[PDB]
Design a binder for this molecule. Structure first.
Ligand SMILES: CS(=O)(=O)CCCOc1cccc2c1cnn2-c1ccnc(N[C@H]2CC[C@H](O)CC2)n1
Lengths: 322, 9
């Protein structure tokens, strides 16, 4: 009575009457997402219906994790929670979780290959880093930032779509069998920034092994010290490739490609796109870089931050929805 | 510098 049902392909969205004009804008393993209009807030929203949250303990655990992080994380550069609801009236009936977010206009996929000025390039990158820094402060290291999971609006604002864990943006740590730390996310920021400048994908590998080869072809074969950190079996492959010297960042990103500034961008790129993470720039240093620091505002860039049965997870999730 | 307020989609 507070709710109505809309058929969305083979799926039924049963949602508060305030949400109208539902249309499917995507799906995946964990949910189906519709664009909608919210009649109470008077704005466009994205409505995500979780897919099989209680099929097993692993689904339930992830669903619980997502709900909590969205509630607790609040930052202008991270997709926020507008609302959560279930159409069911009790724990015994409880089945469906609906998460409501602000509706963004686009992801970065096409936008970054349209040629942008330095102001838009650096402003967008500034917002990305602010989002990431806030994720890291909450103990979330993404590991899978790409243009498709970073969203924007026609007013040049930007939010990170999800909390992470197309291989083009995956750091060498991820590609190979390695440990990672916070700066794993810096690699992905670098790949995006490079793509903005050059107008196409930097390292377009045709498979997971090929992804590695396109990286070294441009940047150079990593040092012996780095090779030592590899697991034995990945090391046997990696270490025995032809030896590439790489190209300087002037060769990779010459003035021709750009709209003091281009020199500053190259410098930043040369520090983000480092194969060996122990020699790669941190998020804090990236935010302080002359190319990025022009936008600095501490309220944005220095903002303050187990085992259960299925029915136990249901209960914990139901509490969270309520 | 003032922040961009537009972006082409
Ligand atoms: C991991 S999962 O839960 O299985 C993923 C389910 C699918 O996720 C999705 C697929 C599509 C959009 C999605 C999501 C998840 N969130 N989301 C959102 C959220 C907020 N705004 C927009 N605008 C959009 C930005 C893209 C643009 O082309 C149209 C407006 N999209």
């Amino acid at each position: 009575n507070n709710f109505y049902s809309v058929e969305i392909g083979d799926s039924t969205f049963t949602v508060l009457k305030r949400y109208q004009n539902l249309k499917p804008i995507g799906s995946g393993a964990q949910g189906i997402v519709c664009a909608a209009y919210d009649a109470i807030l008077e704005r466009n929203v994205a409505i995500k219906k979780l897919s099989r949250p209680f099929q097993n303990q692993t689904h339930a655990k992830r669903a619980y994790r997502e709900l909590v992080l969205m509630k607790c994380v609040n930052h202008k550069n991270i997709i926020g929670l507008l609302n959560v609801f279930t159409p069911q009236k009790s724990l015994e009936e409880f089945q469906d979780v609906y998460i409501v977010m602000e509706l963004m206009d686009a992801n970065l996929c096409q936008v970054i290959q349209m040629e942008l000025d330095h102001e838009r390039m650096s402003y967008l990158l500034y917002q990305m880093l602010c989002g990431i820094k806030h994720l890291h402060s909450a103990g979330i290291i993404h590991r899978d930032l790409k243009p498709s999971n970073i969203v924007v609006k026609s007013d040049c604002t930007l939010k990170i779509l999800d909390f992470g864990l197309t291989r083009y943006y995956r750091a060498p740590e991820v590609i190979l069998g390695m440990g990672y730390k916070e700066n794993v996310d810096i690699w992905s920021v670098g790949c995006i920034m490079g793509e903005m400048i050059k107008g196409g994908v930097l390292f377009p590998g045709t498979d997971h092994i090929d992804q590695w080869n396109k990286v070294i072809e441009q940047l150079g074969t990593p040092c012996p010290e780095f090779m030592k950190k590899l697991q034995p079996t990945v090391r046997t492959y990696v270490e025995n490739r032809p030896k590439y010297a790489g190209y300087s960042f002037e060769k990779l990103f010459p003035d021709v490609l750009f709209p003091l500034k281009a020199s500053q961008a190259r410098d930043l790129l040369s520090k983000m796109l480092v194969i060996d993470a122990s020699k790669r720039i941190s998020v804090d240093e990236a935010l302080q870089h002359p190319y990025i620091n022009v936008w600095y505002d501490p309220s944005e860039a220095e903002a303050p931050p187990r085992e259960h049965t299925i029915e136990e997870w249901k209960e914990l999730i139901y509490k969270e929805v309520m | 510098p003032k922040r961009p307020t537009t972006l082409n989609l």
